[PDB]
UniProtKB/Swiss-Prot annotation, chains C, D:
It is found in: Postsynaptic cell membrane; Cell membrane. Gene3D superfamilies: Neurotransmitter-gated ion-channel ligand-binding domain (2.70.170.10), Neurotransmitter-gated ion-channel transmembrane domain (1.20.58.390). The keyword Glycoprotein applies. The keyword Lyase does not apply. The chain crosses the membrane at residues 211-235, 243-261, 277-296, 342-360. GO terms for cellular component: postsynaptic membrane. Keywords: Cell membrane, Disulfide bond, Glycoprotein, Ion channel, Ion transport, Ligand-gated ion channel, Membrane, Postsynaptic cell membrane, Receptor, Signal, Synapse, Transmembrane, Transmembrane helix, Transport. PROSITE patterns: NEUROTR_ION_CHANNEL (PS00236). NCBIfam families: LIC. CDD domains: LGIC_ECD_nAChR_A1, LGIC_TM_nAChR. This is Acetylcholine receptor subunit alpha. Disulfide bonds join 128-142, 192-193.
Amino acid sequence: VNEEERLINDLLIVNKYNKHVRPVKHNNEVVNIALSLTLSNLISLKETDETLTTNVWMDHAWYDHRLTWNASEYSDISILRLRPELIWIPDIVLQNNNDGQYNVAYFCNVLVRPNGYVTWLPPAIFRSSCPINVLYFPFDWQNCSLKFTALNYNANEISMDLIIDPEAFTENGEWEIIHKPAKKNIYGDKFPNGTNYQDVTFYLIIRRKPLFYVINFITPCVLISFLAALAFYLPAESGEKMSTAICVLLAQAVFLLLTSQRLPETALAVPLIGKYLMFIMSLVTGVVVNCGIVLNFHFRTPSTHSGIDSTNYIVKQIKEKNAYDEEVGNWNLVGQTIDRLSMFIITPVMVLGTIFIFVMGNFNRPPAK
Amino acid sequence: NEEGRLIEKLLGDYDKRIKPAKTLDHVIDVTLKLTLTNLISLNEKEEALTTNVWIEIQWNDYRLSWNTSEYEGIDLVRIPSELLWLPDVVLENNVDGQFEVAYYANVLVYNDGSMYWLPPAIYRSTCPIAVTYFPFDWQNCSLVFRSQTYNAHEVNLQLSAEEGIDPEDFTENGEWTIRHRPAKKNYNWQLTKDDIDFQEIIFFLIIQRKPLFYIINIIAPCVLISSLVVLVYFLPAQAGGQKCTLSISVLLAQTIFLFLIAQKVPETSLNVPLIGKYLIFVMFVSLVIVTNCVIVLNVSLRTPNTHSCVEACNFIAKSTKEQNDSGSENENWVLIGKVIDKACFWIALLLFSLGTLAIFLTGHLNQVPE
Amino acid sequence: SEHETRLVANLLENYNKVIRPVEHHTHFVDITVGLQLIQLINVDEVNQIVETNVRLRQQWIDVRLRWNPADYGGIKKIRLPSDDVWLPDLVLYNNADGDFAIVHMTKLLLDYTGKIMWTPPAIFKSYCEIIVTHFPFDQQNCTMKLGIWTYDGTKVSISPESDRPDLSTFMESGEWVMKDYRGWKHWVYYTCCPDTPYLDITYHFIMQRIPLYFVVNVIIPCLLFSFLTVLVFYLPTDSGEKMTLSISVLLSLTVFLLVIVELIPSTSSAVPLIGKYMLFTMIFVISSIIVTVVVINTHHRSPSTHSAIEGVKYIAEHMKSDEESSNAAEEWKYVAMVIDHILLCVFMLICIIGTVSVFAGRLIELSQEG
Amino acid sequence: SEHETRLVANLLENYNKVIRPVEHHTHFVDITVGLQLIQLINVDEVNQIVETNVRLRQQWIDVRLRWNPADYGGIKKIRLPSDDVWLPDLVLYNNADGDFAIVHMTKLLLDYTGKIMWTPPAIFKSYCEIIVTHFPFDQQNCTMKLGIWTYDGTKVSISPESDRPDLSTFMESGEWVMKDYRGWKHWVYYTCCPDTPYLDITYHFIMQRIPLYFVVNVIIPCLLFSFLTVLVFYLPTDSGEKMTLSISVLLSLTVFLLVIVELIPSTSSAVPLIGKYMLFTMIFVISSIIVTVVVINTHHRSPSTHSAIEGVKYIAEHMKSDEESSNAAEEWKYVAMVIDHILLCVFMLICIIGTVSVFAGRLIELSQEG
Amino acid sequence: SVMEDTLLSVLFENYNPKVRPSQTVGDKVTVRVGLTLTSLLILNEKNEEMTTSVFLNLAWTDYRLQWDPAAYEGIKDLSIPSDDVWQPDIVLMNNNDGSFEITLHVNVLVQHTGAVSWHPSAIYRSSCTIKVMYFPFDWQNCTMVFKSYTYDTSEVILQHALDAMINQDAFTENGQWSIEHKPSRKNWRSDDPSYEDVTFYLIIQRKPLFYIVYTIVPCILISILAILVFYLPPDAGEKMSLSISALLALTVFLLLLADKVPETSLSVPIIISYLMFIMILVAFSVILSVVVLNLHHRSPNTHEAVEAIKYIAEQLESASEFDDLKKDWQYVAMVADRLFLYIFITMCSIGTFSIFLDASHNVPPDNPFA
């Protein structure tokens, strides 16, 4: 009763307090407002289109000079509640990531300190278009930049001063959070003739990539490669499996094509760089080429691919004669070339196969640099 | 005729949230009924549906019988939603989605205090169709709905025919069919042990489906398939030597086709409901097709290999002839096709049996529930 | 000035928005509908759903809105916002799948006399017949009824306004094409009740479907397959050396036909085409089936094909001769005389089936094209 | 009558709902909460989403609701509209994926004393771990914590009430099965702040998953593919004359299972499981590859099997003798002996690594079964 | 103090919220409209759908809000929620395919003598004619017409900033496309009394070069096996059968390609160009491989006494080798050479043609960037 009825009638929040009027002690420098950013969770990542759905605790602070109470308000309880419509609430806009209005971080219950200072901090399910670019894929995986602040007010109606991103990074993400710096600021611009709205700039530098696609995807390559590798070992052990060897090309071919087909599918869902996508398709082509090589190299050669005396001489004639045919073929066989073929298949597989993990490394060394 | 004064009189005392209950020990007389008009989504595997229900709402409140200036003026009045007792409807077992356009609509106040109202509602629900509803015998869809607010000691719902229909406006583009709709008006006491009964509205819907389109897509391929394998089976007796592998090419082709089927329609049942009986005949008549199929190669696998100076030399050459003959003889005792020919008739009648077992039984699982 | 404030305030005070301009017990509130689809955004024949542009021309009179020199004298006709107006609960009968979009908080015009128009720029969600009879070449007429939703011909009546085509603003991006559309009025009294019920505008959409791209891709792999099967006929009679070689094709091609089946039924499921369309493919595709199985079983149909010194010479020559015999036997197996028969046997068959497939194709194309 | 107007008017004036029945600087507001779960309409193991219904049994007290002969006297227990109540922003800590639905606009239980309860038939979408360890045979316990949202201990406190199972009303149509469900309370103060924070109810759902559908089809193609592999090994003995044929079936086989693994990734990522599982299939099947690698590589492992008149009689039989020892050479390689070791070598090794697959598989379920 | 309460009061005493800052029917209020684009997020180039985001900077003058000592001279600039001024309920004649997000109901910047500044960023669902003509290198332009959806230009005039401002001013860096220029022209179609919409031109250029690359490889790599199958005949005539295997293989491959192409344009289609001729290029390799297949088919076969025995021997061998020598005369390799070089002409001609068209397509239809 300590003037309580009278006093909250004095404040009348809505009626006596100007909620449509922001208590910035009138036209001056600004109401000292401060924002605090704490991610509570990251539910979805879209690397390809630079869009992220993430939850944040919108911790907000500013002193409501008309909020200061007396005994039957202040001291009656040095802390009490008052809804959004009865509390000045900063119009915090997610500067480059609010291209998706904020949810339940809107007009929510706020905390009333005793001497005007107020505290409003609810949950924000939001969507953002963070600095992915086609450079959010090299190993550094860029730095996702975001700015928060009270949209409406300027530098003479609002001043917002300034937590790791992995503090509530989602563990079900296909990426890795390496760092998350936080520093506020204020800034005018060229077309504006005055300074204004201060903001929470929070850069998130992350990284991502599976250690799983590598598993089932290179797996078939050394397996498949041994087929093409054996392909050339097999032309020796038994090149006579002509048609059947041919079958395997169809078969290793259809395998190759849609394998690449699964590749862009996951690709579009992921902006993949040009550097990596080529080593994949470049090398399967390496075999594709050698499958075509397989073709020709496997089917490439033009062919390998006194009366009684009179009569039997006829046969010795037919004898020798087609013995020339028979041999016209082994002429083509080309067998002392055999090992060199599969030797100069080994050498190149070694060259290229190495060239890749050689390149793997020559770029694996400098990032680790 | 006091038209102005009357309106202004009751509105003075007019009470919103209070029920037109004479007193408190005998509840009010509430009438309800539903005419189906749209069965928008049948996801039986998850047991849920969406329907535009005519929520026929009716009750009594003479709290406003009028005089010459309103009752007599016109025995009919259309007064706004928010202006009289409103049953917040929902289906106990079904309504899984708050009603849409089922409320906030113009009600009807005759002149004696009779109240009539009927908004249309598209909403979600969950009726049976629990590992059954795909047979030929149908699981009766049982939906009971009532106000989810107060309980029958103040509120009382009424109904009508429990014998007469869901097919009243059952959708013609449904992959199913209805044969009866029974409905009972009842009290509240369930398995869960709730008392103070709030009456509800039971909605039986035993309906049929299965108007197969996929049937003959399944029936002709299998016959073509069976024949294809019976090609594999009889074609060998007709086919040349370069046919053993010929037959193989078919196995490869035969099952490429097979599991592709195994991938096709399995998808079918996941997006829609499911049931194992019809499922059993297919995969196992299918596994037997596969069985005797690979059996065939194991059959075209079985057999051992089918899978004076003058005369001294005339002597020995006449030998290569008899010698190799002994060899070609090998071929003989090996490829005298008793097993193969018979394998044709083996699968043949086995074919007839697998088929008869199945289509005869499909005859039954359509004929008992017929 | 001119009773300025007295003008404006008086008007607010004695005027109840919710009141319906009822005039004695008779004519009901005469209100007319007039829909002009400016354009259509998207449709799904399968799910029979359309999102369309509609400017609803709504007319009615409120003799309470008539004025003198202090309202009409101010400025003849003027702009008054909706709110204050009694909005007919307009509803597409067997349609209505969605709320009117941009019907709310718009404005209307009042004349020096009273007459009011409410014509807010709508676009909404629709629901009209398509049945499995819409994608036909012979189309179906989308039956769409419109009229007053919760008020009767005694409280109110929705009437029509004029004739106009549906292809007047038909979407050129539609996978369908229009024939004509007409709309005539009607009053629905039900044998139920002896009362005189609501009025209604009935739309009839007569349009035939199928964009032509589909046309080309599908019939050409058929004449494609026609040639391989054509080769399936000519390859054997002109060369039985690659019978098995074709074994391959038979596998590669029915599977081609199998996979084309996934693609076009989803088309089937993507767009509702009258099933009688399906039988085209049915026998057509399936003859590829019955013909093969016979053609290739027949292809397959053949047993195995798919002094003393002088005497020495004659026991040896005799050996070469009866195997001589043998060779001719298996060739007496794969003859080239009837493979020619099957060639013309079926090619006439194909030119029959084919021209028979072209038959009903051509025939109702003699009806559709008209 | 009985202070009629004086009693309800006074109640509205000096009564407030924004406020909470705080009673001195102590135990907070005595909130009694509990789960009454009777239906689980939809959940996805993959996304770990759960849309179920649980009536939120709340129980706490507000003396201000106490009364005398003019409210208690009227009718013992009276149920007040919930509005008058300070409703907590309750929410699923690591869950809460959805708004509670059906809690608004409801009934509140008031007593002569003040006791009050309100069990709302709340239905909502949730979000709790299932991870890849959700559906094993050995289960995972989804940690579900619930408690006040934006209010700290200094103002409101909740506590469990009773133990009740999760299977008390668990889904019998679930693709899973329950073992146990426990719920204990606690208050969480954080090292951050010296303050006394919110209270919460933590549920733990312990239940094993996985229907057997995926199971039946993983192993059928395995045994069936092991039949063709078994054929793979046996053929060279019974029909090595079809080694190439064998090749065809490996292109067959390979593509089939390479395609089998396609299904896996879709299904697996379409329905969650702990990777440790696919590891079984991985090597076991890479084993059929590793083995066909060696076995058919080994299968093809072999060089090419993969007077004077008296004189020419001698040049001639010479011609024959040279070639004869030569044909002996290709058979010199296909010794038909190691073919039997390879099927037995691997038949045992597949019977053993199969029995190995069989091993951890059954060991793990001799762990699950438990 | 200086009549502060007074001013303050009178203002709110007389100020009208729902009124237009103009006096009667005239030149109206000249509102300034100008949007600084943020960026764009999704171009559905296939249905011509556009979801972008920009700032809605509006500004005109409220000579009804000019203040005095304290709010005018006290603080020349003050922020105040909109909701109090006519707001362009702007829709887009083509676009505006959906509602406003961050567009209306937000605070505004109000200057001393009445200037009004409102700068809200928003996401808007639009639809511009990017038609199925968003892929030709010559691309096309579009009409983006913004304007209100209940107001008619009679009580306000709309006016723009630049017209060159550009749309690449805030073009999405995430766009697989690019832009040349954005024209801005003010419009008032006379088909409606209401002066209205403003047309904004998109001279868009979208060049995402990514998979047509490995699409080329098929065409050419498939050619590898193609030229190969055309090269394999005089390379390994025995290609005879293996050849057919190639085309099964070659055809399935191209048909799967047929599979990914329709489903990929499924979201970003435009002119056929690429497909038009690769469709021909398709038909080309298709038929070329099939007629070469018929090239392959055309072969009906390919696809004293002592001394007497001798003499009988002399004739045996020689006699039939001519017969098989006849087969040589029949399957010589004239055609293969000639058409493998007709293969030379065909494939290198049709090759350098689409090579050319494609060549001509990227360079020739490139400059219409306007």
